[PDB]
Scaffold this active site. Structure first.
Site, PDB file in Angstrom:
ATOM      1  N   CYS A   1       0.815  -1.163   0.000  1.00 29.87           N
ATOM      2  CA  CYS A   1       0.000   0.000   0.000  1.00 29.87           C
ATOM      3  C   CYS A   1       0.872   1.244   0.000  1.00 29.87           C
ATOM      4  O   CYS A   1       1.773   1.306   0.709  1.00 29.87           O
ATOM      5  CB  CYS A   1      -0.805  -0.072   1.303  1.00 29.87           C
ATOM      6  SG  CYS A   1      -2.120   1.192   1.436  1.00 29.87           S
TER       7      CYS A   1
ATOM      8  N   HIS B   1     -10.304   1.296   2.108  1.00 32.37           N
ATOM      9  CA  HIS B   1      -9.757   2.599   2.472  1.00 32.37           C
ATOM     10  C   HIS B   1     -10.826   3.620   2.827  1.00 32.37           C
ATOM     11  O   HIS B   1     -10.640   4.414   3.749  1.00 32.37           O
ATOM     12  CB  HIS B   1      -8.907   3.179   1.340  1.00 32.37           C
ATOM     13  CG  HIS B   1      -7.478   2.743   1.365  1.00 32.37           C
ATOM     14  ND1 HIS B   1      -6.692   2.828   2.495  1.00 32.37           N
ATOM     15  CD2 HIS B   1      -6.678   2.262   0.385  1.00 32.37           C
ATOM     16  CE1 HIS B   1      -5.469   2.417   2.209  1.00 32.37           C
ATOM     17  NE2 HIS B   1      -5.434   2.069   0.935  1.00 32.37           N
TER      18      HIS B   1
ATOM     19  N   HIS C   1      -9.694  -3.508  -1.925  1.00 31.78           N
ATOM     20  CA  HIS C   1      -8.606  -2.847  -1.213  1.00 31.78           C
ATOM     21  C   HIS C   1      -8.927  -1.349  -1.114  1.00 31.78           C
ATOM     22  O   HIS C   1      -8.772  -0.740  -0.054  1.00 31.78           O
ATOM     23  CB  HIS C   1      -7.287  -3.064  -1.976  1.00 31.78           C
ATOM     24  CG  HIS C   1      -6.094  -2.399  -1.359  1.00 31.78           C
ATOM     25  ND1 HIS C   1      -5.032  -3.111  -0.843  1.00 31.78           N
ATOM     26  CD2 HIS C   1      -5.765  -1.091  -1.232  1.00 31.78           C
ATOM     27  CE1 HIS C   1      -4.097  -2.271  -0.431  1.00 31.78           C
ATOM     28  NE2 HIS C   1      -4.517  -1.039  -0.656  1.00 31.78           N
ATOM     29  N   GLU C   2      -9.386  -0.758  -2.213  1.00 33.90           N
ATOM     30  CA  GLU C   2      -9.704   0.668  -2.208  1.00 33.90           C
ATOM     31  C   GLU C   2     -10.970   0.996  -1.419  1.00 33.90           C
ATOM     32  O   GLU C   2     -11.023   2.006  -0.716  1.00 33.90           O
ATOM     33  CB  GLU C   2      -9.837   1.197  -3.639  1.00 33.90           C
ATOM     34  CG  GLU C   2      -8.601   1.008  -4.513  1.00 33.90           C
ATOM     35  CD  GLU C   2      -7.308   1.394  -3.820  1.00 33.90           C
ATOM     36  OE1 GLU C   2      -7.312   2.352  -3.018  1.00 33.90           O
ATOM     37  OE2 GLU C   2      -6.280   0.738  -4.093  1.00 33.90           O
TER      38      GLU C   2
END
Ligand SMILES: CCCCC[C@H](CC(=O)NO)C(=O)N[C@H](C(=O)N1CCC[C@H]1CO)C(C)C
Ligand code: NI
Length: 179
Positions: free
Chosen positions: A105, A152, A148-149
């Site tokens: 990341c 966030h 993954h995003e």
């Protein structure tokens, strides 16, 4: 232009907050931010530009990583290349998957070994830069990047998913992607 200077790192509280929904119609500023985010990803993947600008390569980026707590993510998977506003996972597979080499990341300046298990298939709805809705079915690597995003924008980091006790444990049935 976005460079590493704009990407906040682990320790900055914004990375753990829940990002705010963005207006629809999409504001011109949010449109501009999305453009700059996609440009960063493309620049980071260009061998020459990445060297010129000293960028770490990335295939995804979320607004919170730029200290902008908004539900905006950009992806550029070598395909899938777009900016998603207010993305949401409507459904997912039972079947899970994980990258064989683990994850990293741009906001994390340390190596955290271990498998990050995610859903292999997901159906995602989002608004594009024009405020038009899209419903897409993603799988494999593309699904991994988007999860993954989206993590966030919910204040979740990849290492939150690692089994510290047994980092390379593989539950019977999980798929593995090797890049
Ligand atoms: C697959 C999940 C999406 C990863 C997105 C990150 C970019 C990021 O910080 N997003 O928030 C990335 O490109 N990370 C890279 C990464 O983890 N990669 C690049 C190739 C596939 C995978 C290997 O572990 C390394 C270079 C830091
Ligand atoms: Ni990340």
């Amino acid at each position: 232009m976005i460079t590493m200077k704009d990407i906040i790192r682990e320790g900055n509280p914004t990375l753990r907050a829940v990002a705010e929904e963005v207006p629809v119609p999409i504001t011109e500023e949010d449109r501009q931010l999305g453009e700059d985010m996609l440009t960063f990803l493309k620049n980071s993947q260009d061998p020459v530009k990445a060297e010129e600008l000293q960028l770490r390569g990335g295939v995804g980026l979320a607004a919170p990583q730029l200290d902008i707590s908004k539900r905006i993510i950009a992806v550029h998977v070598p395909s899938l290349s777009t900016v998603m506003y207010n993305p949401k996972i409507l459904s997912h597979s039972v079947q899970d998957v994980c990258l064989g080499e683990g994850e990293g990341c741009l906001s994390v300046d340390r190596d955290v070994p271990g498998y990050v298990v995610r859903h292999n298939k997901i159906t995602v709805s989002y608004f594009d830069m024009a405020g038009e809705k899209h419903k897409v079915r993603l799988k494999n690597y593309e699904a991994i990047v988007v999860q993954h995003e989206i993590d966030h924008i919910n204040g979740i980091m990849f290492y939150d998913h690692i089994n510290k006790e047994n980092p390379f444990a593989l539950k019977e049935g999980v798929l593995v992607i090797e890049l």
